[PDB]
Assembly symmetry: C4
Homo-oligomer: 349 residues x 4
């Protein structure tokens, strides 16, 4: 009913009393808090603050709580000017969600102290000196493990085996680390759904199941042997770029389906267009359409080994079209992935 | 003649009566609708609304209907503030056309009910459960058809033929689907000009004409056989990225002419510059200028099979220039295509 | 001395009389032109125009002539609002130079009429029907000429020669066209400095000098023969993308020097780093540092023919570094070239 | 206590006296300087200046010194309007640091004159004609030196050696130049920490140590011989793009660690996934996991020599995945490097 004139260094704003009456916990809400700024001479609440930012605040008061930072007032000034009018931590968290970078999560510390000290030791390498010692010994053990996996397959080589002893030491360290992390955890229920620990479990299961099978088929001699390579992803816990890549390959999971689907269409199109072109030629490298898949996938991605290439004046035309088509399809859903990685990289820094 | 002062929370706007008299169906147009906001004390129409957005509204009233959203007021607030002053659905559709994303099309439903129910069943997979069942069976039939086209050409293989029986089943399903879509259509005239149905017709004509020719030349044994591959594009009806790609390759049809023309110039330039360089050498792979086309098109697009490469200290210079020139020409009209795909992808989402 | 209050729909602007007295040919300059807008009631020049645009106009009046379009008011409104206050064609051309797209050039027409009619016939294909006929016959003659240059070098082939007769016809057409363009020109002095005509001269000189030499050395049998290929650039007069490419490769002539210099450094670095690595090996493909240039330039540009590749566990490391280095150097000065092409392409459209 | 109304051409700003009293050396600070603008009629300090820029100035006066250029007022106007109110060189340097391009460094000239003249002669080629003569002779000597390093290793060739005499002349010139730069320097302490002189020292040490060893092992016959190539980086002193590249490869040193780490993960993943796939095949090119590193690094970077490629229907699948994975990883940290180069290139121009 009563009009409140708010003189932001000359810029007058007029509002109804009810519009401020929405929030009785803000600076303009309580009559007593704002009464010091009242000037009897012109009956206007004199402020000397930033001008282009009070408009957003007033719209907040006039919209029930919505806050939109105008692009004119930079982030710092608008932060200072949302603090001054003391809209509250709720409004500030709302503005944080609107602008992005929602760093409102807090890592929960174990209930007791001893277990919490274990946690701060094994996790958060920067917490303590011994913590960073542990977190560097557990990256040297991983590098030793990778070297012993890659070096065990040499032709000169392939339980007195030194490589077996090194692998057993690596698994013992992995087990000890995982046991400390699971037992001394704040909650097993939250621990269970965590990729960085499912990886640590998957990188140790093959060794245990191998010992069980040997102590007591072709699947457990090739698939398990390959699964043993997942210890390369345990190098994500002690690294930062890898977590960014994992979050990128999780956010942009549809623009990888597009890349694979576009490749699958361009292979079935150009391989079938180059086989039917070489059909009469007796010198052709392509015996059938499913044979030219290996040519289309190394032409569209512009690798081009040269082991299989077209050999008629009609397969050369299709292989001129295939390179341009591969450039167009594999570079139409990659920039989306690169923009999502750029966002997931510059948010943290 | 009379000046109307409009106090947008202190920000006064003064306008002539004639300027509001243009539109007698808006909030400020009818005197009775706006009379509730009139304040006798200062003779100004008091509003408590968003300030930076009323300027665009006033310019609308002062320009005969033109609307331009100022970049200061975000889309949501400006939408709320074009609703409040009730400019009309016409102005709102105009603002939608100005900002982009013209989602004003409505799918026409068949006149009757039974035919409309058929339509909602075969089209719009999300409409009904059986609708999504049909729309997934018709993607499995397509995948079976592609597998039978790609697998019929194996050397071990090439009407008791199992592959013929599978292909006949696929064509019968395609025919049944197309017949349901054409008969139970809202309008055959609008149905005719639709790419996604011309594709469905082109992917079934070769089978019918083959049966006709066999039941009763070299063209119908190679060109038709190749045309049978167009069933890979029937996988666009049951997919979303493919429609985006088709619209991209339709919007940016000049920046593909540029890519093909730039390739055609760089081939005729560098192949003719590498043949004349290898002319005296007896070991050269290039016998003539039209022979070095197959080297220039696999060098400029940076595939490089190695089957044909230069062999003098003067063809090696031209093959050092060719790679850099191919990078420069094929990556000068591709970013336009990628920006048009980015627009056609982020409009829908 | 006297303050002029200018009420832009409530937004008052106050200025000195001297500030408007700078320009006695504008709307606010002449007292008689602006006197109709004077309102005796409040003594303020009432306007109902766009508000956010009059600030730029007032700054123009207060800065001696400088004009800067504020990013708030779109181009169309600001154009309308620079027309209304009738700042002049001079100010409008200044604003055109500030915003870009300086389309103020006008093609000069020949002094007389007959010669001007010839010009409108041979140039400006869209001017007349016969003009477009000529401009399409002169693109078919060019394509015939390219085909006869590329097809004369076939092994089966290489003055009763049909190819000679076709080439003579092409040169006769080129000569006739060039003669019409030079004679019936507005100015030979301006005609001389024009690339698109220097190209037309260079594509015809080799034929004349060949006839002179044959009618009456090794240089005139290879270099001139290669120079004959410049008729591919005569296809720029009858094309639009090619002119954009030529202007791109003229504007960004320093970011090609960077590409060539970066390649020249990475070749001299990695070829010298891979030769010294393979020195003891007897199976190496690299005999000397200037021999590994042909490997470094097909690795850094990621073509990779495979004709020359490293063969020790120390040349394989350098060839792992070479691919990543080539990606980093040849893709550090290419995006500048692509942005200059994007500007030179979207300016015209 | 007293309110100062500042009429920026109608736009009134009201401020406390204390807010201007912060800075007693600015235009509004001293009462005498601002008294000429005081108007007794309305008691407001009349200015006719740019309107959208005075808000930033007022916020400067109200924030203790902080300055943020609003994006509405272009750089030129805001520069003019920070000069007018004479905020000071300190504020102007602060605004320069805020906007970027901190060109506040000044090259220190030697204390005396003769030594300063030497400096202006050897450095700053544009200072003097003889200076540019020296700075071009020292780029021809470098090019001669590179040619003699690259040409000494030819098979036909490998102290009467002409190549030795040319190399000795080059080193003598390098020594003379370095001696002049170090002796006639403003400060040896600042001279020591400078990359462009450490390079000049490293490109001359190998020759001196070679003469010492020969005048009076395998390391000094290969590693030193390779180190002799660092004279290619002495071509950075007499070039501008190279300094930009060096600053790019210094600023973005983490997004190269990402490229190398992503390559190291994708090699250990796909090489181990293609070796285990080819294990039973007797025709495989991969004998062990550390052997397939040379395939993964020439597939992921899409070079693809063809010397080693997969040969089973299970290694071909992994080599279809490897090309797409290499495109995704090596093009996820390259655009950061390219944006840092774009910044370091367009700052100087
Ligand atoms: K390649
Ligand atoms: K290749
Ligand atoms: K190759
Ligand atoms: K490539």
């Amino acid at each position: 009913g009563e009009r409140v004139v708010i003189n932001i260094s000359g810029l007058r704003f007029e509002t109804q009393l009810k519009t401020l009456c929405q929030f009785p916990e803000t600076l303009l809400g309580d009559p007593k808090r704002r009464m010091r700024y009242f000037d009897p001479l012109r009956n206007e609440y004199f402020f000397d603050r930033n001008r282009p930012s009070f408009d957003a605040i007033l719209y907040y008061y006039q919209s029930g709580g919505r806050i939109r930072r105008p692009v004119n007032v930079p982030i710092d000034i608008f932060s200072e000017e949302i603090r001054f009018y003391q809209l509250g931590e709720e409004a500030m968290e709302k503005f944080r969600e609107d602008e992005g970078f929602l760093r409102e999560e807090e890592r929960p510390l174990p209930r007791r102290d001893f277990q919490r000290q274990v946690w701060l030791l094994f996790e958060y390498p920067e917490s303590s000196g011994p913590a960073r010692g542990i977190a560097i010994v557990s990256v040297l053990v991983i590098l030793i493990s990778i070297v012993i996996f890659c070096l065990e397959t040499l032709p000169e080589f392939r339980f007195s085996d030194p490589f077996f002893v090194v692998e057993t030491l690596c698994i013992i360290w992995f087990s000890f680390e995982l046991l400390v992390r699971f037992f001394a955890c704040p909650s097993k229920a939250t621990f269970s759904r965590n990729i960085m620990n499912l990886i640590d479990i998957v990188a140790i299961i093959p060794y245990f199941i191998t010992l069980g099978t040997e102590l007591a088929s072709l699947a457990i001699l090739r698939v398990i042997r390959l699964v043993r390579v997942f210890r390369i992803f345990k190098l994500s816990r002690h690294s930062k770029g890898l977590q960014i890549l994992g979050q990128t390959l999780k956010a942009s999971m549809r623009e990888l389906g597009l890349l694979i689907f576009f490749l699958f269409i361009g292979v079935i199109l150009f391989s079938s267009a180059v086989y039917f072109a070489e059909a009469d030629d007796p010198t052709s490298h392509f015996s059938s359409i499913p044979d030219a898949f290996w040519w289309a996938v190394v032409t569209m991605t512009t690798v081009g080994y040269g082991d299989m290439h077209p050999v008629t004046i009609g397969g050369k035309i299709v292989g001129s079209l295939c390179a341009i088509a591969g450039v167009l399809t594999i570079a139409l859903p990659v920039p989306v992935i690169v923009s999502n990685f750029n966002y997931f990289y510059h948010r943290e820094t």
